Amino acid sequence: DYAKKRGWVLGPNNYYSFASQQQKPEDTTIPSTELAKQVIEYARQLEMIV
Amino acid sequence: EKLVSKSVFPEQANNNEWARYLYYTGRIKAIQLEYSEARRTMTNALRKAPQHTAVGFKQTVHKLLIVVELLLGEIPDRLQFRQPSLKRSLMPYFLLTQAVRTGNLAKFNQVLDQFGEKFQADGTYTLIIRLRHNVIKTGVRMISLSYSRISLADIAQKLQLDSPEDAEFIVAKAIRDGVIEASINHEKGYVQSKEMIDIYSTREPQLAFHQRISFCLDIHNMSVKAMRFPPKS
Amino acid sequence: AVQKVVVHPLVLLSVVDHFNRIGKVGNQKRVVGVLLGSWQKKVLDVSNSFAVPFDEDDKDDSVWFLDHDYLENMYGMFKKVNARERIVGWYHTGPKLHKNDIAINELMKRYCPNSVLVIIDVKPKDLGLPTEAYISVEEVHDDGTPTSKTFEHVTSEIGAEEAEEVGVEHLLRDIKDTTVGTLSQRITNQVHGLKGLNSKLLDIRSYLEKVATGKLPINHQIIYQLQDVFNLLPDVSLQEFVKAFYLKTNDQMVVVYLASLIRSVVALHNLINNKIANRDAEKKEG
Amino acid sequence: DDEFEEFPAEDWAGLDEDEDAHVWEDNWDDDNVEDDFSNQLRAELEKH
Amino acid sequence: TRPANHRQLTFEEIAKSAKITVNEVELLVMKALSVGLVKGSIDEVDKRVHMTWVQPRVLDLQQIKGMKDRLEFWCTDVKSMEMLVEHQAHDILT
């Protein structure tokens, strides 16, 4: 019953997977918009009159 | 805790008021269970205190830092203990660490008992007690750092424990806490440490350098703002 | 083959003056003349120009007059004034290529076989160079069979001698923003380049629309070229490429971080010096 | 300065004289009690 | 036919769509590259093959529309990010 309550696959007898992989995040997409804004802000602060 | 969590520290104070706020927040966390943030805030404070004066303040932060790190399974560096301004003010903690490394409950009890009233006076006793039942943690972190995979029976032999189930459980709880990075696998009966990942290839370096660059530009804007040309005063 | 063609500001301004004078005369939509210059081993050098009376029938693109006798007389007089310059080609101020162009070029081709045509628009609604250069070549097809003469575009730019540079920079006191620093390398590009790319892509899209809607026929060399274009476009989801991009961005960041540290230290030093100077001035004043 | 007179320093009641006062580098490992490394090698050889 | 992203065939698929045994497939692609039909390489270890480009081929009035739609996507992207640059960079470049 307790195994049922939790998210356990309930494999072979006394054999349940916990999915410790955590999906193993490997995908990467090069977030650019943020990087472009960051760089333009460097340039802004660099050239404004302070 | 409620008060601090609700009010906001103004970002323009002295060095000294920042040091005091940081010490109190560090102490309040260490009294609760968030050890790592307490360690971080404390080191920030110690790095923000006046250089020459505040011998008592440095003493306070250093003793609390020692206790918290010990509570974290790391080993604080021996450089400080021989500094003149904190040499004789930490001998209790010197013996304490000598005990925590080569864990000997006999020696831990001897040092706690003898230098007991002093610990209580400092305002830490509770934490050093929290240590006394965590003396194993140092050993398990050492075993992980040293070995990339070890059989559980070997751990039991190395930690002077009872049947290897106790060590099994302690290791599992540890990895749960986050002090160690590994994966247990009993069907062969060995705990396996996780490989080393390449930090540079990720985007961490970009983020860190961006933060630091922002700080530097802000320093410059402030610095050129502070100028006053009063020759027409 | 010409690797490059360099026009001089005087030529551009002279063509603009020509178009203004004729339009003031009116009843025209294009102008035609010559171009004088020399060669520097495949790096042309256009340096001067003069007019040549010309007229055309807008309705039918097979009627036109171009007083070549005027061209020969003016070549005589100019060659009397400056020997080092010989005819190089011909220019016209119509917006875009006309149908007569091959006819005129074959007429012009007598004076200079290696004749390059330079179109100088005088009303730029765009963000880009004001000139386009074209060289007439025979084109043999795999299926298009008959061999005609088509214009092949050749790289062009603007160049000036010290005297012209001085004069132009003097006249350019109507707007001026140098800021050679980051401001220029971010207005002259990034924005400018993106705007130009967008305009070009929009022209390609208009033509594609026209073909698809039947208003035109299909051209196979264009379709093959567009297929190659779409095949060139890189993919940015390859772990190898992401890894390389992050590595290089990181190096660039460490350098900018060092630069900012340097600058902060210098500005702080300046503040300290100003403070010390103020304190000394007060103490001396007190 | 803002001397933290609020916080107290350590009492100088005992203030025992320095035992050795050595200042070379301290280092953590020096506390450990080894067994005369040569002795460990000799015992190894005896046991093989 | 394979979409641009994948475009990574397998020997077995060659052998099944050309009616040739796997052993003799390699010579086919080797020759195809040699003549000038497709550029790429071969992975004998993994029995795969990467085709970086295929000879241009005439397209009917349907694939023309697909190519036009891809161009629309391209133009929209370009304008979006031109706007991002200009707006975020307004103050300096007025």
XYZ file of C-alpha atoms in Angstrom:
711
model
C 0.000 0.000 0.000
C 2.756 2.467 0.899
C 4.563 1.762 -2.371
C 1.239 2.377 -4.113
C 0.916 5.755 -2.404
C 4.348 6.779 -3.673
C 5.300 6.997 -7.333
C 7.037 3.625 -7.617
C 6.907 1.478 -10.747
C 6.458 -1.729 -8.707
C 8.645 -3.927 -10.865
C 9.704 -7.480 -10.016
C 9.030 -8.565 -6.437
C 10.784 -6.162 -4.052
C 12.169 -4.477 -7.185
C 10.956 -0.904 -7.724
C 12.724 1.825 -9.704
C 13.105 5.266 -8.113
C 14.046 7.037 -11.376
C 17.188 8.544 -9.858
C 18.189 9.710 -13.353
C 15.982 12.805 -12.916
C 15.672 12.809 -16.726
C 19.436 13.512 -16.860
C 19.023 17.021 -18.334
C 21.326 17.247 -21.357
C 19.401 19.319 -23.928
C 20.863 22.778 -24.589
C 19.481 25.453 -26.917
C 21.810 28.480 -26.535
C 19.491 31.055 -24.908
C 20.289 34.132 -26.996
C 17.726 36.885 -26.386
C 18.909 37.129 -22.790
C 22.521 37.236 -23.946
C 21.822 39.953 -26.509
C 20.036 42.086 -23.922
C 22.896 41.576 -21.489
C 25.445 42.746 -24.025
C 23.461 45.771 -25.169
C 23.128 46.760 -21.509
C 26.874 46.547 -21.045
C 27.186 48.920 -24.002
C 24.502 51.245 -22.637
C 26.119 51.637 -19.232
C 29.438 52.007 -21.032
C 28.442 54.974 -23.199
C 25.858 56.881 -21.136
C 26.854 60.036 -19.283
C 27.091 59.333 -15.563
C 13.409 34.684 12.036
C 10.046 36.160 11.140
C 11.356 39.710 11.562
C 14.381 39.207 9.334
C 12.349 37.310 6.760
C 9.918 40.212 6.524
C 12.076 43.391 6.584
C 14.634 44.341 3.919
C 18.164 45.437 4.717
C 18.889 48.736 2.950
C 21.697 48.214 0.487
C 23.610 51.331 1.593
C 24.979 50.883 5.101
C 28.429 50.965 6.612
C 30.840 48.081 6.702
C 30.072 47.695 10.407
C 26.275 47.609 10.291
C 26.474 45.142 7.424
C 28.794 43.007 9.546
C 26.377 43.060 12.479
C 23.336 42.195 10.359
C 25.245 39.384 8.722
C 26.418 37.953 12.028
C 22.942 37.904 13.491
C 21.419 36.306 10.394
C 24.191 33.729 10.344
C 23.595 32.898 13.987
C 19.852 32.608 13.522
C 20.245 30.221 10.604
C 22.873 28.105 12.325
C 20.423 27.758 15.206
C 17.914 26.500 12.668
C 18.868 23.867 10.091
C 20.225 25.616 6.975
C 23.902 25.163 7.725
C 25.348 26.146 4.351
C 23.753 29.583 4.141
C 24.871 30.298 7.694
C 28.426 29.416 6.699
C 28.237 31.694 3.670
C 26.761 34.687 5.497
C 29.314 34.314 8.278
C 32.257 34.298 5.898
C 30.838 37.372 4.198
C 30.668 39.080 7.594
C 34.197 38.116 8.588
C 35.294 39.488 5.224
C 33.412 42.729 5.868
C 34.625 43.532 9.403
C 37.179 46.219 10.289
C 40.707 44.933 9.743
C 42.443 46.028 12.955
C 39.886 46.474 15.727
C 37.047 44.151 16.790
C 39.197 41.396 18.279
C 36.142 40.148 20.148
C 34.020 40.308 17.010
C 36.501 38.277 14.996
C 36.664 35.820 17.867
C 32.880 35.483 17.829
C 32.527 34.930 14.105
C 35.501 32.581 13.926
C 34.280 30.323 16.709
C 30.812 30.169 15.190
C 32.287 29.519 11.737
C 34.394 26.680 13.093
C 31.366 25.121 14.755
C 29.149 25.449 11.681
C 31.732 24.064 9.253
C 32.381 21.136 11.573
C 28.625 20.645 11.531
C 28.870 20.568 7.747
C 31.334 17.667 7.459
C 34.202 19.789 6.140
C 37.434 20.495 8.036
C 38.274 24.167 8.699
C 41.813 25.166 7.811
C 44.509 25.255 10.493
C 45.920 28.637 9.477
C 43.741 30.715 11.805
C 44.344 28.818 15.037
C 47.938 30.089 15.259
C 47.048 33.704 14.484
C 48.014 35.804 17.530
C 44.663 37.521 17.950
C 42.802 34.196 18.027
C 45.440 31.768 19.299
C 44.381 31.260 22.903
C 40.736 32.132 22.255
C 40.133 28.941 20.235
C 42.168 26.225 21.971
C 38.821 24.575 22.801
C 38.060 24.442 19.112
C 41.581 23.307 18.224
C 41.169 20.293 20.476
C 37.642 19.891 19.123
C 38.832 19.571 15.533
C 41.749 17.352 16.500
C 38.965 15.186 17.907
C 36.570 15.445 14.958
C 39.135 14.329 12.391
C 40.381 11.225 14.211
C 36.926 10.662 15.624
C 37.275 9.215 19.109
C 34.120 9.560 21.171
C 36.316 9.126 24.231
C 38.364 12.147 23.191
C 35.289 14.099 22.120
C 33.682 13.484 25.495
C 36.877 14.378 27.339
C 37.193 17.710 25.530
C 33.492 18.571 25.718
C 33.365 17.794 29.437
C 36.572 19.588 30.409
C 35.914 22.718 28.330
C 32.179 22.540 28.938
C 31.279 25.632 30.923
C 33.252 27.609 28.333
C 31.256 26.245 25.391
C 28.068 27.090 27.249
C 29.356 30.600 27.918
C 30.075 31.191 24.227
C 26.450 30.534 23.299
C 27.090 27.542 21.026
C 26.852 24.474 23.268
C 23.725 23.311 21.464
C 25.548 23.168 18.140
C 28.597 21.306 19.427
C 26.117 18.778 20.788
C 24.526 18.561 17.361
C 28.008 17.678 16.132
C 28.621 14.924 18.645
C 26.137 12.626 16.929
C 27.416 13.552 13.436
C 31.077 12.619 13.907
C 30.571 9.889 11.284
C 29.802 12.387 8.528
C 33.396 13.533 8.138
C 34.429 9.928 7.609
C 31.818 9.211 4.950
C 32.656 12.374 3.015
C 36.303 11.359 3.178
C 35.458 7.883 1.900
C 33.546 9.387 -1.014
C 36.289 11.853 -1.959
C 38.949 9.131 -1.813
C 37.116 6.266 -3.536
C 35.177 6.231 -6.802
C 33.395 3.022 -5.804
C 33.597 1.012 -2.595
C 31.812 -2.044 -1.281
C 29.537 -1.381 1.666
C 31.349 -3.994 3.754
C 34.569 -2.054 3.209
C 32.838 1.067 4.521
C 31.684 -0.822 7.598
C 35.240 -1.995 8.228
C 36.591 1.527 7.735
C 34.118 3.316 10.023
C 34.417 0.948 13.016
C 30.679 0.258 12.736
C 28.389 -2.694 13.344
C 26.937 -4.833 10.549
C 27.200 -3.124 7.136
C 23.499 -2.218 7.178
C 24.202 0.705 9.523
C 26.790 2.139 7.124
C 24.424 1.442 4.240
C 21.740 3.532 5.880
C 24.078 6.352 6.884
C 25.395 6.633 3.327
C 21.891 6.688 1.862
C 20.778 9.412 4.266
C 23.926 11.362 3.438
C 23.350 11.305 -0.305
C 19.806 12.386 0.493
C 21.135 15.397 2.413
C 23.310 16.508 -0.510
C 26.653 16.368 1.295
C 27.866 13.691 -1.152
C 27.137 12.912 -4.816
C 26.846 9.182 -5.515
C 24.455 6.304 -6.227
C 23.942 3.144 -4.145
C 23.525 -0.216 -5.866
C 23.267 -3.190 -3.527
C 22.709 -5.961 -6.085
C 26.505 -5.851 -6.276
C 26.884 -4.188 -2.879
C 28.902 -1.056 -3.588
C 28.219 2.676 -3.445
C 29.362 4.456 -6.597
C 30.490 8.071 -6.774
C 29.348 10.262 -9.635
C 31.768 11.405 -12.300
C 33.081 14.953 -12.623
C 31.136 17.241 -14.964
C 32.720 20.005 -17.027
C 31.736 23.351 -15.527
C 33.215 25.510 -18.278
C 31.281 24.071 -21.205
C 28.011 24.925 -19.477
C 26.857 28.522 -19.120
C 27.990 29.043 -15.516
C 31.127 31.005 -16.505
C 29.084 33.474 -18.519
C 26.738 34.111 -15.591
C 29.520 34.601 -13.072
C 31.468 36.981 -15.258
C 28.296 38.919 -16.061
C 27.562 39.483 -12.376
C 31.102 40.616 -11.690
C 31.108 42.938 -14.715
C 27.892 44.554 -13.519
C 29.458 45.131 -10.120
C 32.506 46.766 -11.691
C 30.475 49.125 -13.867
C 28.387 50.106 -10.847
C 31.578 50.824 -8.904
C 32.668 53.136 -11.708
C 29.369 55.009 -11.924
C 29.374 55.563 -8.164
C 33.018 56.599 -8.207
C 32.563 59.249 -10.885
C 29.350 60.366 -9.201
C 31.067 60.937 -5.859
C 33.182 63.637 -7.454
C 32.346 67.242 -6.397
C 34.172 70.085 -8.127
C 33.611 72.936 -5.677
C 36.444 75.311 -6.696
C 33.504 77.692 -7.133
C 32.661 77.063 -3.482
C 36.650 39.317 -64.869
C 36.857 42.342 -62.567
C 37.535 41.640 -58.902
C 36.403 45.098 -57.795
C 35.316 48.505 -59.081
C 35.951 51.718 -57.144
C 33.962 54.849 -57.935
C 34.901 58.296 -56.712
C 32.616 60.721 -54.840
C 33.020 63.274 -57.617
C 31.401 60.856 -60.078
C 28.400 60.283 -57.824
C 27.871 63.968 -57.204
C 28.282 64.741 -60.902
C 25.625 62.202 -61.850
C 23.284 63.686 -59.246
C 23.910 67.147 -60.682
C 23.202 65.754 -64.164
C 19.887 64.242 -63.106
C 18.910 67.450 -61.340
C 19.721 69.527 -64.422
C 17.773 67.265 -66.806
C 14.804 66.910 -64.464
C 14.762 70.679 -64.131
C 14.680 70.402 -67.918
C 12.042 67.739 -67.242
C 10.270 65.098 -69.300
C 12.775 62.377 -68.420
C 13.112 59.490 -66.002
C 16.699 58.390 -66.637
C 20.055 59.847 -67.587
C 22.985 58.308 -69.453
C 26.645 59.250 -69.701
C 30.157 57.887 -69.636
C 32.743 57.120 -66.962
C 36.440 57.948 -67.159
C 39.186 56.069 -65.367
C 42.109 53.673 -65.491
C 43.011 50.132 -64.453
C 45.230 48.748 -61.699
C 45.424 45.054 -62.635
C 41.767 44.066 -62.279
C 41.057 46.751 -59.589
C 39.249 49.362 -61.660
C 39.408 53.075 -60.851
C 36.571 55.357 -61.951
C 37.485 58.985 -61.403
C 35.416 61.354 -63.543
C 32.421 61.592 -65.840
C 30.595 63.741 -68.360
C 27.219 63.776 -70.028
C 25.977 62.268 -73.283
C 22.609 63.335 -74.762
C 20.168 60.449 -74.813
C 16.444 59.827 -75.190
C 14.194 56.792 -75.160
C 10.642 55.641 -75.825
C 9.097 54.578 -72.529
C 6.274 52.630 -74.161
C 8.434 50.376 -76.370
C 11.933 49.345 -75.303
C 13.352 49.275 -78.824
C 13.644 52.994 -79.667
C 16.512 55.084 -78.337
C 19.039 57.710 -79.376
C 22.523 58.274 -77.954
C 24.682 60.881 -79.658
C 27.914 58.913 -79.854
C 29.420 61.835 -81.755
C 29.085 63.890 -78.579
C 30.859 61.078 -76.768
C 33.816 61.182 -79.139
C 34.106 64.976 -78.981
C 33.968 65.033 -75.195
C 36.501 62.243 -75.017
C 38.786 64.385 -77.127
C 38.393 67.426 -74.892
C 38.685 65.543 -71.597
C 41.687 63.613 -72.883
C 43.166 66.997 -73.668
C 42.602 68.085 -70.058
C 43.652 64.807 -68.384
C 45.552 62.184 -70.359
C 45.802 59.540 -67.619
C 42.039 58.883 -67.777
C 40.463 56.810 -70.542
C 36.882 55.655 -71.005
C 36.002 52.843 -68.628
C 32.282 52.273 -69.065
C 28.909 53.954 -68.870
C 26.359 54.881 -66.212
C 22.658 55.603 -65.958
C 20.348 56.803 -63.211
C 17.324 54.586 -63.712
C 16.303 52.739 -60.566
C 16.886 49.195 -61.834
C 18.097 47.387 -64.917
C 16.333 48.187 -68.187
C 15.892 46.113 -71.321
C 17.989 48.332 -73.594
C 21.017 47.818 -71.379
C 22.506 45.054 -73.526
C 21.961 47.099 -76.684
C 23.721 50.168 -75.298
C 26.506 48.072 -73.826
C 27.139 46.478 -77.223
C 27.250 50.001 -78.612
C 29.611 51.096 -75.858
C 31.624 47.914 -76.173
C 33.486 49.461 -79.088
C 35.137 52.127 -76.952
C 36.162 49.695 -74.228
C 35.613 45.935 -74.625
C 35.928 45.433 -70.864
C 33.106 47.890 -70.272
C 31.368 47.787 -66.888
C 27.972 49.393 -66.326
C 27.450 51.379 -63.124
C 23.906 52.322 -62.120
C 23.684 55.257 -59.708
C 20.274 55.582 -58.098
C 19.653 59.168 -56.985
C 16.810 58.519 -54.489
C 17.853 55.763 -52.089
C 14.888 54.246 -50.244
C 17.037 51.640 -48.508
C 20.068 51.202 -46.249
C 22.884 50.289 -48.622
C 25.357 51.410 -51.229
C 24.181 53.840 -53.929
C 25.790 52.095 -56.932
C 25.527 48.740 -58.693
C 28.075 47.478 -61.236
C 27.379 44.978 -64.019
C 29.583 43.317 -66.670
C 28.174 41.775 -69.840
C 28.991 38.116 -70.424
C 27.841 35.316 -72.704
C 25.743 32.740 -70.866
C 25.516 29.155 -72.137
C 22.673 27.018 -70.808
C 22.223 23.321 -70.130
C 18.615 23.651 -71.340
C 18.059 27.386 -71.914
C 19.990 26.646 -75.139
C 20.287 30.001 -77.081
C 23.362 31.930 -75.878
C 22.458 35.529 -75.012
C 24.383 38.211 -73.130
C 23.465 38.744 -69.474
C 24.897 41.113 -66.894
C 26.995 39.575 -64.120
C 27.178 41.648 -60.946
C 30.667 42.606 -59.799
C 31.742 43.989 -56.446
C 31.756 47.786 -56.219
C 32.752 50.346 -53.601
C 33.438 54.045 -53.061
C 36.925 55.502 -52.847
C 38.420 58.951 -52.631
C 41.728 60.753 -52.865
C 42.838 63.092 -50.095
C 41.420 66.144 -51.873
C 38.005 64.547 -52.319
C 38.047 63.286 -48.742
C 38.782 66.796 -47.479
C 36.013 68.340 -49.552
C 33.376 65.763 -48.657
C 34.198 65.860 -44.951
C 33.839 69.628 -45.197
C 30.434 69.444 -46.863
C 29.259 66.701 -44.481
C 28.564 69.395 -41.886
C 24.850 68.641 -42.105
C 24.980 65.595 -39.810
C 27.982 63.930 -38.111
C 28.296 61.208 -35.442
C 31.700 59.512 -35.285
C 31.631 57.686 -31.894
C 33.993 55.147 -33.435
C 33.431 53.194 -30.259
C 30.733 50.674 -29.687
C 27.992 53.072 -30.846
C 29.193 52.982 -34.449
C 29.963 49.273 -34.555
C 26.358 48.791 -33.370
C 24.497 51.312 -35.511
C 26.486 50.751 -38.720
C 25.744 47.054 -38.341
C 23.578 44.642 -36.394
C 20.587 46.929 -36.976
C 21.670 47.987 -40.462
C 22.557 44.471 -41.541
C 19.341 43.009 -40.188
C 17.327 45.657 -42.024
C 19.116 44.904 -45.289
C 18.742 41.146 -44.916
C 15.048 41.650 -44.265
C 14.622 43.764 -47.387
C 16.414 41.190 -49.555
C 14.383 38.315 -48.136
C 11.236 40.323 -48.768
C 12.167 40.765 -52.432
C 12.771 37.023 -52.751
C 9.389 36.428 -51.139
C 7.601 38.821 -53.492
C 9.052 37.020 -56.508
C 8.152 33.635 -55.065
C 4.598 34.875 -54.562
C 4.444 36.084 -58.152
C 5.631 32.753 -59.549
C 3.298 30.726 -57.346
C 0.285 32.859 -58.255
C 1.009 32.362 -61.963
C 1.897 35.974 -62.766
C 5.289 34.735 -64.050
C 6.934 31.582 -65.412
C 9.245 29.254 -63.506
C 13.018 29.694 -63.673
C 15.031 26.619 -62.796
C 18.373 28.222 -61.952
C 16.579 30.332 -59.337
C 14.974 27.254 -57.826
C 18.299 25.424 -57.636
C 19.929 28.489 -56.072
C 17.200 28.761 -53.457
C 17.542 25.075 -52.647
C 21.264 25.580 -52.100
C 20.491 28.618 -49.927
C 18.133 26.641 -47.717
C 20.678 23.840 -47.542
C 23.386 26.207 -46.286
C 21.426 27.371 -43.210
C 23.193 25.934 -40.142
C 21.629 23.991 -37.297
C 22.156 25.307 -33.775
C 21.045 22.231 -31.803
C 24.229 20.194 -32.164
C 25.983 19.555 -28.870
C 29.316 20.131 -30.596
C 28.247 23.552 -31.835
C 26.701 24.587 -28.521
C 29.876 23.515 -26.769
C 32.012 25.580 -29.108
C 29.781 28.653 -28.833
C 29.782 28.565 -25.035
C 33.546 28.098 -24.923
C 34.139 31.154 -27.067
C 31.570 33.325 -25.282
C 33.281 32.447 -22.005
C 36.689 33.581 -23.252
C 35.216 36.845 -24.508
C 33.633 37.381 -21.059
C 36.847 36.866 -19.120
C 38.466 39.557 -21.228
C 35.613 42.044 -20.726
C 35.656 41.313 -16.983
C 39.354 42.137 -16.775
C 38.722 45.327 -18.730
C 36.000 46.447 -16.327
C 38.172 45.736 -13.284
C 40.895 47.917 -14.787
C 38.417 50.728 -15.422
C 36.935 50.592 -11.921
C 40.359 50.834 -10.320
C 41.255 53.825 -12.490
C 38.011 55.665 -11.708
C 38.440 55.028 -7.980
C 41.963 56.394 -8.192
C 40.594 59.504 -9.863
C 38.006 59.951 -7.103
C 40.702 59.588 -4.451
C 42.901 62.163 -6.148
C 40.014 64.611 -6.433
C 39.130 64.092 -2.769
C 42.727 64.663 -1.687
C 42.900 67.786 -3.839
C 39.671 69.119 -2.326
C 40.870 68.381 1.211
C 44.179 70.116 0.555
C 42.404 73.120 -0.937
C 40.125 73.362 2.099
C 42.989 72.994 4.592
C 44.964 75.672 2.766
C 41.832 77.826 2.666
C 41.033 77.321 6.355
C 36.941 52.789 13.326
C 33.939 51.278 15.148
C 35.641 49.117 17.761
C 33.194 46.404 18.797
C 33.642 47.140 22.480
C 30.152 45.676 22.687
C 31.698 42.253 22.068
C 34.183 41.095 24.736
C 37.625 39.661 24.104
C 39.066 36.629 25.853
C 40.047 36.684 29.525
C 43.761 36.655 30.384
C 43.412 34.841 33.723
C 45.564 31.811 32.930
C 47.617 33.013 29.956
C 50.009 30.078 30.159
C 53.361 30.567 28.459
C 53.783 29.152 24.963
C 54.720 25.472 25.080
C 57.079 25.551 22.080
C 55.947 28.610 20.082
C 57.071 26.986 16.819
C 56.068 29.084 13.825
C 57.149 27.159 10.752
C 53.860 26.275 9.054
C 51.738 24.233 11.498
C 49.880 22.133 8.878
C 47.077 19.743 9.842
C 48.842 16.398 9.411
C 51.458 17.110 12.094
C 48.941 16.219 14.808
C 48.592 12.617 13.662
C 50.552 9.946 15.512
C 52.293 7.702 13.006
C 54.520 4.730 13.844
C 58.064 5.647 12.821
C 57.695 4.941 9.108
C 60.864 2.857 9.073
C 59.186 0.673 11.691
C 56.168 0.109 9.444
C 58.427 -0.890 6.561
C 60.347 -3.301 8.779
C 57.139 -4.896 10.046
C 55.922 -5.259 6.467
C 59.132 -7.046 5.500
C 58.869 -9.343 8.520
C 55.307 -10.180 7.476
C 56.012 -9.895 3.741
C 13.206 13.212 -48.958
C 14.656 12.868 -45.475
C 14.223 16.138 -43.544
C 17.267 18.375 -43.276
C 17.688 17.774 -39.543
C 18.109 13.991 -39.742
C 19.505 13.296 -43.220
C 21.608 10.446 -41.780
C 20.798 7.202 -43.587
C 21.646 3.619 -42.709
C 23.218 0.948 -44.885
C 20.329 -1.423 -44.250
C 17.906 1.160 -45.632
C 20.029 1.555 -48.768
C 20.060 -2.227 -49.187
C 16.289 -2.404 -48.754
C 15.448 0.493 -51.097
C 18.023 -0.283 -53.830
C 17.848 -4.106 -53.879
C 21.524 -4.608 -53.050
C 23.271 -6.536 -50.292
C 24.724 -4.528 -47.434
C 28.253 -5.566 -48.374
C 28.139 -3.826 -51.755
C 26.317 -0.681 -50.604
C 29.503 1.213 -49.763
C 30.723 1.273 -53.358
C 27.428 2.800 -54.472
C 27.678 5.815 -52.179
C 31.419 6.089 -52.745
C 30.702 6.437 -56.459
C 27.787 8.826 -55.938
C 30.085 11.161 -54.028
C 32.862 10.749 -56.587
C 30.740 11.796 -59.561
C 29.417 14.904 -57.807
C 25.811 14.093 -56.892
C 26.060 14.455 -53.098
C 28.760 15.523 -50.633
C 29.217 13.820 -47.291
C 31.068 10.917 -45.748
C 30.628 7.322 -44.607
C 30.617 5.713 -41.161
C 31.596 2.106 -41.823
C 31.871 1.504 -38.075
C 28.232 2.391 -37.442
C 26.983 1.536 -40.958
C 25.549 5.037 -41.432
C 26.178 7.878 -43.867
C 25.866 11.680 -43.629
C 24.709 13.579 -46.718
C 25.630 17.225 -46.290
C 24.024 18.293 -49.570
C 22.094 16.835 -52.512
C 22.174 17.898 -56.125
C 19.539 20.531 -56.920
C 16.337 19.147 -58.377
C 13.382 20.787 -60.062
C 10.336 21.359 -57.873
C 6.674 21.654 -58.759
C 4.318 24.399 -57.666
C 3.749 22.805 -54.244
C 7.267 22.666 -52.823
C 7.507 26.253 -54.037
C 4.920 27.163 -51.418
C 6.785 25.309 -48.693
C 9.920 27.233 -49.576
C 7.982 30.507 -49.504
C 6.549 29.718 -46.070
C 10.034 28.974 -44.799
C 11.038 32.378 -46.130
C 8.156 34.001 -44.230
C 9.323 32.390 -41.005
C 12.791 33.725 -41.758
C 11.541 37.277 -42.349
C 9.475 37.264 -39.147
C 12.466 36.121 -37.110
C 14.661 38.787 -38.664
C 12.242 41.604 -37.896
C 11.631 40.418 -34.359
C 15.274 40.531 -33.486
C 15.995 43.787 -35.353
C 13.310 45.304 -33.134
C 14.799 43.750 -30.015
C 18.188 45.236 -30.838
C 16.910 48.702 -31.664
C 14.643 49.012 -28.625
C 17.122 47.662 -26.100
C 19.774 49.924 -27.647
C 17.706 53.082 -28.017
C 19.227 55.522 -25.586
C 22.753 55.337 -26.983
C 21.807 55.354 -30.646
C 19.005 57.896 -30.748
